[PDB]
Write a protein that binds this ligand. Sequence first.
Ligand SMILES: CC1(C)CNC(=O)c2sc(Nc3ccc(I)cc3F)c(C(=O)N[C@@H]3CCCNC3)c2C1
Ligand SMILES: Nc1ncnc2c1ncn2[C@@H]1O[C@H](COP(=O)(O)OP(=O)(O)NP(=O)(O)O)[C@@H](O)[C@H]1O
Ligand SMILES: [Mg+2]
Length: 292
Amino acid sequence: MTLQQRKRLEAFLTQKQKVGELKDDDFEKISELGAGNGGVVFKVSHKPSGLVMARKLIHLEIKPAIRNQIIRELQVLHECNSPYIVGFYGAFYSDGEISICMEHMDGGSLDQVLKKAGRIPEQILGKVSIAVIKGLTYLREKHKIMHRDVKPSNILVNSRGEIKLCDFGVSGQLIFVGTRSYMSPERLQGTHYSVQSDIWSMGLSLVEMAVGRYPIGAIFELLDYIVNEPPPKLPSGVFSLEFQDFVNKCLIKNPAERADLKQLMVHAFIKRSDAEEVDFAGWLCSTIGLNQ
Ligand SMILES: CC1(C)CNC(=O)c2sc(Nc3ccc(I)cc3F)c(C(=O)N[C@@H]3CCCNC3)c2C1
Ligand SMILES: Nc1ncnc2c1ncn2[C@@H]1O[C@H](COP(=O)(O)OP(=O)(O)NP(=O)(O)O)[C@@H](O)[C@H]1O
Ligand SMILES: [Mg+2]
């Protein structure tokens, strides 16, 4: 950690304390940040602190004993404190819906950023990759947590140039209803799986952000393709050989021959990217623009 990262984390944990138990009454809606797989996210104001938060509403049908164990397992999120993880405020049940309250990220997700930028430059994706790896490393080492839901909508960014992971499961399992999938071939097979599965998800997400589009290229037809056909790749000529090799190594279908976190962190793409002074914050703020 840099001193500034060390300090930014300090700064967050103090006003987190300036927050008591959370209740539906204490929240005031500002705007809607989006929705997804059965979750609605709202930009909220928490009046007792006056703090801006993001509040996710999860309609989990049926309580009672099952809902109170969910909230108690969610309490580990208080201990997840990293410059590569989104800050947690608290969680409760209300009106048949679990609410997870977290740090508000003003740049939104890289899914939203991509939709704006068209495609995200390779040098920026180096900064994103370093952050994702470090966040996945942190979750593994400090909490023995695997993410299980790496994708562009779960990598959040802000006007301070921070890149953070969110929506990592903490309740066990509890682990295709949509049109796209970031699940590895081995996860689709029902096979046992590990953090190698998150590496595939990261690799796929990177190719989506580099080219501007989900790269595979009906839901069950798509899943069959992931399982049975060659992995996606970057186009040649427009991306560095080492970036191509980096995603290729993330996208090897055998999770055991696929690169691991340790290997990727010393990979030539990561080595090069880490030494590059790239103004990511300026890129992001110039790309999204300012509220006017
Ligand atoms: C059901 C759940 C509350 C179990 N507890 C769980 O363990 C979680 S945790 C968690 N998200 C989460 C994780 C970390 C941070 I920082 C912020 C977060 F919002 C989530 C979460 O949102 N899951 C969504 C439910 C809708 C469909 N997609 C998966 C969960 C799931
Ligand atoms: N802390 C946050 N700050 C800003 N935006 C957020 C935050 N959390 C979630 N969002 C946005 O809310 C939208 C919907 O989030 P979500 O319900 O997590 O959908 P999803 O990420 O596509 N699916 P999943 O993460 O699997 O539940 C996304 O576009 C996010 O960018
Ligand atoms: Mg999400």
